[PDB]
Structure formats: C-alpha cells, structure tokens
Amino acid sequence: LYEEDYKLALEAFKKVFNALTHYGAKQAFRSRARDLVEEIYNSGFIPTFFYIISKAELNSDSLDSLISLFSSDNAILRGSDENVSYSAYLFIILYYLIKRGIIEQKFLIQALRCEKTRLDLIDKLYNLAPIISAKIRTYLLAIKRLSEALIEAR
C-alpha cells in the first residue's frame, strides 16, 4: 500500500512551493512536474535522473539550499528558473528516497556536501533504480496533480 505517499507528496510540495520564490520558477516547476514523470516511465529512471541532474546545475549554493530545505523549510532556491525548477524536482525525488528509507539521510546529505561522493550517490541510485522506479510512481503522480492544481497555468 502507498497511501502514505499522499502525505509525503503534500509536505514535499509545500517545501518546494514555498522555496521557489519567483512565480516563473513555480510555473517552470509545474512544467517539470508534468513532463518528467512521463519521461521517467517511458524512458527509465536512470536516463531521466541523468537528464535532471544535468539541468539542475548542482553547485555549492544550490546544494546547501537543498540540504537546508531538507531541514529548515525557510530556505529559498534562487538561480535561473529553469535550473531552479529542475533542482526542485531533484529535491522531490531525493526527499521521497529519504523519507521512505531507500537512501539514508546521512549518506545522501554527506554526498551533497562533497564531490567524491556525488558520483557514489549516483552509483547508489543506479543500483536501486528498479526499486525507485517501482515505488516512486504514486508519489510522483500526486506531485504532478498537486502542481497542476496549486500553480497557475502559464
């Protein structure tokens, strides 16, 4: 059963909603929420994850924003609305993986803090791609509906 994933979707959405401060960032994330789950389940989780990270521009600023967001709920994601939206989606995925015990919050938060470890994080993801794809679908669909409902069409 996956009924928990609606609570999870709601809180993660509240996060990445009150993080993206400019409304263009919100509408960009809306487009991401729509198309990226389609891509995940048509192409695969690993290809789409590579595509996401490549468009998220994981620098030190973005990654401390993400980590503080895991913790704070006062963080704010800046930096070129396309990139900030792809990073919001990256956070959605990582937040599921954490809050459901697939990646360990400690290992992940470490990996976003150092560069030798980003590669190992990506490798760890690759090794669990079947499980992540199987288990994240309901959560992602809920997020997609939430964005369609709460963020205004562009």
Partner: protein, 345 residues
C-alpha cells in the same frame, strides 16, 4: 434553566444557580440575594409570611437533586407538550410528503415511511429535516413554519429543533421483494444511527457526534450525509440554516451537472483527487484541489460553484463493520449523486 426565566425572576435564578460548588454548598448562598424577591411586596399585599428560609432552601434542593444528578425533572406538561409538538409535526410532514409525489405508509410522531420518485428525495429531506426542527420556506397546508415554532396562523406552537432526526433512503427496483427492502431500510438506519460517528463542532471545538445522519443505498453503494455539524443542533436562533446544508450543496451540484455546465466525469474523476483531499488538512490546499477538480471537467470554463470550507475536514468515523463507507464527506457527496443519478437506469 437559568435563561428560561425573564424580567427579574431570571436574576432570581441567574445568581442562585451556581452557588453550590461556587458557594458554601448549602441554603445560605441565596439568603443574601433572596431579598430582590421581597423587593416588590407591598402594593396589594396578599402573602401570609415573608420568612423565607424554606423557599430559598427548596429552590436550592430542587436544583441540587437535578445538578448533583444532571438530568431534567419531567412533568405531565413536559410529556403532553412533546406529544402535541409531535402531532403538529405529523400534520406538517403529511403535507410535505404529498407536496412531492409522495405516498405515506406510516406518518408517526417521530418517525415516517413513504415512497417517492427518485427525483424528489433530497429536496424532500432537506425540508422535512428543517421542517422537523421548525423552519419554513413555505406555508404547508395553512401552518406557518417560523423559526423554532410552528405558528398556526396565530398559535405559535413550539417545534423540536433540538431533537435530532435521522433518515434512511433506499433506491429500490420495483421488482424487488418488499420484505427485504423494508428490513434493510430499518436495519440500515437501525445500526447506521448506532454505528457512525462524524467530526462535529461542540462548544466551538471539535467533537465526534453519533446521530442525525441521512443514509442512502442504491444496491451496494451506501452513502451518508450528516445533517447538523453542530452540537446542540441549533444553539442560536439563526442556526436554522446549519441544518441539512450539505443537501443544499448536493442540490446545487446535481442541478448544474445536467444543465451542461459540468461534465458527467465529475463523479468519475473524484477517484483521482480523493486521496490528496483526504490526505490534506490545510483547508486552502483542499479548497484549491476541489476547485481544480471542479474546473477540469467543466463544459464551459466560467462556472464557479464552490463548496464551503467547513465541509472539508469532517470525517465519517465508521468502525468495525462489513459495510463500506468512505471516511470523508466529499466522497459521500459524490456517492449520494452516484446513487441518485443511478436511480434512473
């Protein structure tokens, strides 16, 4: 009790009441304040004695045996008044039923039984419940159904708004054995009254009531509409529109589904929004989810029919029974219309 008085006698009670735990627990609290009774004696004096060390003691013992044990005292007047009020209700719902294309089987003091076409059910209930509490959008035969009373053209007669009233509605094929329909209506409301709790508003806070429901069933599609969402039912003189407000919602919805404002899919797409709505508790997120579900299956783009906010967080706490009831109101708003629009195939 303390308000049932008026004028000055009200104060006579408005002080004497709490002086039990609030005071020395015995017949000396009021003796201090008793004097505003004797403050009217000499204009045409008739009384024999003014030494009231008894009528303060007796008006204390009275309330003591009834607040020490918080029941009421019953009188012949109590009973006869209630039975009469039941008879006025009898008349008024006898007019209600056949106001629609109804057919009484048994109109009773506090109960009823009828057969109606599947088009006149909700609108009936919506008034018959209200009318039972005493409220009229109409003159029925010649009785004026005012707020709280049923005034027979000069005779304001008290109705029973505080009394709850549940409903049980079965949408039965004409080629169904009446034995079963009667049994599974009686038992439906029979255990439905005694099984289903819902999130209610007592003293301002949130409680879980247990009665004043309005149950439906098509053939395996049960639905439940609460009717008060407040406890007591109408604690204020204008609470008389809290009652059966949900069926007003269902009427405003069903009225617009078929007028070509809202698609038919409104009741097939809730199975996609239901999970988020019931997983939400931030009532503006839920408001926006509902607004989106309303808008995404609108035939125009310009209909703006909104549900009240208070109908968002209520939860139908049914427990441990092989009957299937959705645990959130809007799903029941959906299923009621499922039934009713299904009662036409």
């Amino acid at each position: 009790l303390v308000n049932a008085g008026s004028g000055s006698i009200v104060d006579y009670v408005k002080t004497v009441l709490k002086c039990i735990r609030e005071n020395l627990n015995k017949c000396s609290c009021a003796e201090k304040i008793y004097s505003n009774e004797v403050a009217k004696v000499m204009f045409r004096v008739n009384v024999e004695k003014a030494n009231v060390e008894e009528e303060v003691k007796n008006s204390l013992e009275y309330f003591e045996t009834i607040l020490n044990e918080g029941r009421i005292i019953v009188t012949p007047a109590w009973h006869v008044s209630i039975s009469s009020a039941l008879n006025r209700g009898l008349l008024v719902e006898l007019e209600l039923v056949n106001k629609h294309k109804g057919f009484v089987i048994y109109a009773g003091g506090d109960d009823l039984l009828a057969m109606l076409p599947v088009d006149e059910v909700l609108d009936f209930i919506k008034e018959s419940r209200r009318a039972f509490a005493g409220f009229g959008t109409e003159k029925l035969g010649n009785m004026c159904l005012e707020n709280g009373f049923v005034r027979i053209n000069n005779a304001y007669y008290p109705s029973l708004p505080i009394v709850g009233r549940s409903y049980s509605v079965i949408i039965a094929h004409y080629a169904d054995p009446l034995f079963f329909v009667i049994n599974d209506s009686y038992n439906l409301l029979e255990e439905g009254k005694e099984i289903i709790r819902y999130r209610v508003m007592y003293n301002g806070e949130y409680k879980d009531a247990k009665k004043d429901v309005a149950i439906f069933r098509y053939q395996g599609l049960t639905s439940v509409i609460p009717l008060s969402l407040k406890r007591p039912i109408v604690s204020s003189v204008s609470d008389f529109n809290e009652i059966a407000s949900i069926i007003d919602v269902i009427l405003e919805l069903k009225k617009r589904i078929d007028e070509g404002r809202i698609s038919v899919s409104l009741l097939y797409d809730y199975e996609k929004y239901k999970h988020l709505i019931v997983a939400s508790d931030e009532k503006y997120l839920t408001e926006f989810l509902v607004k989106d579900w309303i808008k995404r299956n609108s035939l125009r783009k310009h209909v703006e029919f909104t549900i009240d906010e208070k109908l968002y967080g209520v939860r139908l706490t049914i427990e441990n029974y092989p009957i299937k009831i959705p645990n959130d109101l809007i799903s029941n708003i959906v299923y009621t219309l499922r039934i009713i629009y299904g009662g036409e195939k």
